[PDB]
Each structure stands twice: as C-alpha cells, then as structure tokens.
Amino acid sequence: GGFVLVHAGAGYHSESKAKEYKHVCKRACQKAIEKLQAGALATDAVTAALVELEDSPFTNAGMGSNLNLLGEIECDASIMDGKSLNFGAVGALSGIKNPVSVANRLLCEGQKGGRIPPCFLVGEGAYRWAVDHGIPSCAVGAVVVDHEGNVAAAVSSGGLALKHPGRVGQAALYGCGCWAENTGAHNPYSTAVSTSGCGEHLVRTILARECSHALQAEDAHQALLETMQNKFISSPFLASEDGVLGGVIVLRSCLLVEFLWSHTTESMCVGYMSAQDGKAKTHISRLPPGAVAGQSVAIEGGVCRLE
Amino acid sequence: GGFVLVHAGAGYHSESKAKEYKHVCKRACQKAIEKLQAGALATDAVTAALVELEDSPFTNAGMGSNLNLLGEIECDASIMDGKSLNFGAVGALSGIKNPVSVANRLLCEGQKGKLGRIPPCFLVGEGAYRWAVDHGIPSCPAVGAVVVDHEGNVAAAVSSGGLALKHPGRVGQAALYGCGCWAENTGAHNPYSTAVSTSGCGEHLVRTILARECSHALQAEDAHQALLETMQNKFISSPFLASEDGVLGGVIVLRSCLLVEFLWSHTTESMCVGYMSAQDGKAKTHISRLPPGAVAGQSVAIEGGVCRLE
C-alpha cells in the first residue's frame, strides 16, 4: 500500500555520475516503500527517502553539499504533510548530518501544538534546536502517497555553489520547495510536489504551490506543461534571467496515482516505486533533441494503481 | 505625484500607545512623500518610510523589536518592486539598525543583474549581517508601507522583530516571499498595479501566503470585495488554519490604474495606519478598530478610500 517518486536533482548532465544518481534514487524509493509497509506515516516515509538521498556524497544535499563562499556547508530543507497541512523547514543549517530529519521533527512537534511551535528555523538556532531534540550532528526530493491516500512531500538542498553565507533557497521556503495537500472542498485531488534547480527561480515563481494549483485541473499533463511554460519559463517574475532552470516531481491521487516529472535543465534523475509491485524504476530525463536548456520543457509521467 | 500608506502595531488596542503609533506613521508618510517629490524610486520611498517606522521605539521592528528566548534581537524584513518584480529579504538578522535597508540594498544590487552570478534575494543570520556590513549598511556598536510613484510604479515593504521570546533563529512572515509583502505593476494578466504589506501572527500569514493572495484577488474590479473575500475565505476560514482558535493579521493595500485606491483590513482589535498624497500634503493618521460586537481573530474590519494624482 503506497507509492513514491524521488529525484536526485535537476541540472547539468553527467554521463559518468548518472549511474550514481540512479542508484541512490533506487535506494531512496526502497527506503520509502519499506517505511510504508511498516505502517509508518507518509511524512516518515518521505523523510526516509530524503535521508538516503542526502547521504549520497553525489547529491547536493546533506553530506556532499556544495560548500558556500566560506567553504562551509549550509543546508536548506522542508517537508509538508497533506493530511494535516502542517509544514517543517530549516535554512542555512550546518553541523547536522540529515537536514530533512530536523524539518520532519519540526513538523511533528508542530502536531503537538498557548503558542504555535516554530515551523521554520535558520542557522545556529536551527542547529541548537536539532541537538536539543537528539538529532545527530555531523537538490533532492520525494513525494509519497500512503495506503490511505494521504500525501507528503519533502526537499533538501545544499544550495548554490559558493553562495554567500546565509543565502537561503527554495528548499527552505513554504510553497516554493515542496507542497502536500490532501483532497478537500476546493482541492479535488490530493497533490504532492517537490522541486529542484536555481533556488531564486523556484522561489520567485512559488513553483511548488503553483504546480499543485494547476494540478487541480482535469488534464494533469497539460496542466503541468502550461505551468512550466507560462508560470516558469515565461514568468514575468523571471524576466531578469537568461534561461530559467528548474525541475519538479509531482504526484496526484484520488487508489489511482498519476505522477509526473518536468524540467528545463539539461537533465533530471528520477526514481519511482509502487508498494504492491516492488521493483524500483529509475530514469535520467533529458531535454528533447536539439532542445534549448532554460528555454524549453521536458515532461513525462505515468500512472500507478494501488489496490 | 505619488501616494503612500503605512501601518504600525496591528494587534491589541492601547489608547495609551495610540498617539505614539500615530506620530511615527505621520513622519514615515512624510519621509516617503519627500522621497517621491525628489523624484526618488518607489522602492527608495517605501524604504524611507520603513526606516522611520523601524526607528520608533514603540514598534516591534528594528530598534525596539521584541527579544527572543535568549534575550537577543532577531529581525525579519523584505521589500518588493512592482516595476521589475524583484525582491529582497533578510531573516533572523541582528546587529543592524534598519533591517529594511539591508533588504532594499539586496534588491538594488540584484536589479543590476548577472552581467557575475545570479544575485541572492534572501539572506539570514550571521551571513545577512556580514553582507550588510560589507555593503556599508550601518550596524550597532510588524510595520509596513506601500507606495506608488507618479509613473504608476508600486512598491511594498515590511519589517518585524517577530514573536516575543521566540526560539533563536525563528523566521516569520516579514522575511518570506509572498507572505510579508507584495508589489506588482499592471501587466497583461494583471490590469492593476498592486502593493500589499501584512502584519499579525507570523504563522497565520505564512501558511496562507496572504500578501500574494491579496494582490491576486485585487485583480478583480471591486477592490473592497476582493480584499474582504480574501480576509474571510483565504485567511480566517482558510483550511490551512482550521486548527487555530482565532486568526490574527492585518494588511494595507494600494491599487492604481492616476487613480489610487487604498485600503486596510485586519482581524486584530486594532491597527494604526497613516496615508498621504504627494499633492494633498498633511499626513493623515488613524487607529482602525474592529466594529462593536465583533470578535478579534473571528471577524474582519476594512476601510479605505480613493486618491487622485496628476
């Protein structure tokens, strides 16, 4: 009972590291499905996927993250639960092995509930909070749907290479890095979204939420393509860019699960797996023949039936 | 030509402090008008207003911001430009007198473009501090504003010290894109130039990405209905805040098509606002309060007017 879709990042293609990206995606899916079969929450299953993705020294998230301008690792990560709509996030976080675990814990403590617990912490404060909650001290994304139709999403990143210290990207921002929202009065489908690419491009277009909105339309493939074209590549908010670089993985369910991935970057490695079927599928998505990176859109999808 | 609208201290009503809020809103508006009259950029004028608002010891922003759990000050601020649609923001920033000045500088630098890497739009903590100092921004030894210039260009900014006794590093809506403020000039799919600035419970404003939601709603002919529908449906009754016992927030908005419609709305007991036209002179300050019999966090208050520019 369950389905997962993950990505190891959207960016330059690597005919040498592609094998590494596909393997971690395979392992990440395995982790997520195993959690679901253990009867774990969708948030816990998406978190497990991200931990595996972060741990790969080949991914720009967690260990192996791009060093910033000071030669330090500063991580961004967030997670959202479709059932409760709660969210957890950390930005510019250093000294913590798995940034996504901190985000997940923040979301969980959020459930507990006068004063509303913090949903977004940065820097030292985020580090202090993590240690205070027993989280081990020392880009990638996933969307999941459990056997009950609940959806969750998460994203983790090391941010731009040599970025100025304190520079925060889309992986830490609400509505930008990921989105998870179960079916509701004005939300026909339970949708989950996770993004990757130039943080600035994804933030200014609030891409994750935008994709989720678009996905409430009848045709998911047309809906996502129009979003990537009009609300991203041709977005007036990115008129200041010479090429828009980003990728997304999406899941929509009602269990009938439709999943897609789309990117404007040269490539994007994805992986997916269905619980009642096993066997993780991986794929390096690349832009069509003679296409233009930052100017065109690659898009693919599939469907999963959860009995 | 030009118009400005600012706000300070959206929350509980305190007559003893009302006068103080009014005074700072008045000078913030004057600083903004002075800029515009001197042919300044809409973003510089809104920044000028925020500097004044932050400098008041009575506002939870800049000097006078609430202290966090460790007794330290950590500020959040952002500004957006309707012309270029560019944005600048800082979060959990300490050691800087006027957080909004850092966000405005980030925006200005970013507008310069890559021509040698994609400019940052959001910096936090120590890094934010270092960037500020490296860019000549005065260091140490919510409030908001929306503006429209004579050309119809709009801008908005917001600044806050966040929740009192908050955990170190907790960043609120004043630093988050689409939540604290929004500014967007008329376009092909946006018949109006709109500017929005928010205030209230950080959590509530973020979960609803209120500032942006307001700007999008305001693309409907009726501004008054657009704002009211948003505060009720997209805020108080939003499914994203269903578990909350009361939703607390306030917003100031400006929409131009030179015709300038300006409004403020809030679910808090009160909110102090100030507005001024570049041609009318004399700042107008007002303490907006919820109607009698209305419950804070459960109801909405809304007021405003129209201004003509030439």
Swiss-Prot record, chain A:
EC numbers on record: 3.4.25.-
Keyword Lipid metabolism among record annotations: no
Catalytic machinery residues: A139 (nucleophile)
Molecular function, one GO term: identical protein binding
Record disease entry: Suleiman-El-Hattab syndrome: An autosomal recessive syndrome characterized by global developmental delay with poor expressive language, poor fine motor skills and hypotonia, microcephaly, feeding difficulties with failure to thrive, recurrent respiratory infections, cardiovascular malformations, cryptorchidism, happy demeanor, and facial dysmorphism.
Family in the record: Belongs to the Ntn-hydrolase family.
Name recorded for this polypeptide: Threonine aspartase 1
UniProt lineage: Eukaryota, Metazoa, Chordata, Craniata, Vertebrata
